[PDB]
Amino acid sequence: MGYRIEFDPRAEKELEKLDREVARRILRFLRERVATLEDPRSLGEPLRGPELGRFWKYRVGDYRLICHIQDREATVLVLRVGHARDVYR
């Protein structure tokens, strides 16, 4: 069993803009760790805020990845991708 790995039209660029090794590390980390992880909510944490809630974030060394978990179709679509500094968390 393994959830789907999707990337929004905005993140795709926000990620590709990052270093080569860094990009491959993220994509793989999700296609390797999360991919095998019986559940996507294992190596990630739910965002915090009165405006936003239903959102899962993953930790990648020094990079924060904001993805959205969809139980309906067990699909993980990345919303935003930026270094810890970039993200508001």
Side-chain angles (χ1 to χ4, degrees):
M1 278 272 145
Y3 282 51
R4 188 150 90 163
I5 316 300
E6 277 311 326
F7 280 72
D8 269 323
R10 296 290 162 177
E12 271 293 17
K13 277 286 163 169
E14 295 270 81
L15 162 153
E16 276 308 282
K17 81 90 78 271
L18 299 172
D19 173 69
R20 174 90 162 192
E21 293 175 284
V22 179
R24 169 199 272 292
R25 176 181 204 77
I26 290 163
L27 285 169
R28 270 271 176 172
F29 162 80
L30 280 152
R31 272 164 88 70
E32 295 210 291
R33 308 285 80 181
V34 186
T36 72
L37 286 164
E38 294 281 53
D39 271 306
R41 299 187 284 182
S42 171
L43 282 162
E45 62 192 336
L47 272 164
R48 272 208 89 160
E51 186 301 296
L52 41 72
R54 275 200 159 163
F55 304 102
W56 208 259
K57 160 151 49 52
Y58 290 105
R59 45 182 203 180
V60 175
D62 316 329
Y63 291 79
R64 279 41 184 84
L65 317 176
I66 302 74
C67 320
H68 195 211
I69 301 166
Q70 281 178 20
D71 310 295
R72 177 71 172 279
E73 279 182 69
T75 300
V76 182
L77 187 153
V78 187
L79 270 163
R80 177 271 200 70
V81 170
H83 193 282
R85 60 179 277 172
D86 285 270
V87 202
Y88 329 100
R89 271 153 280 275

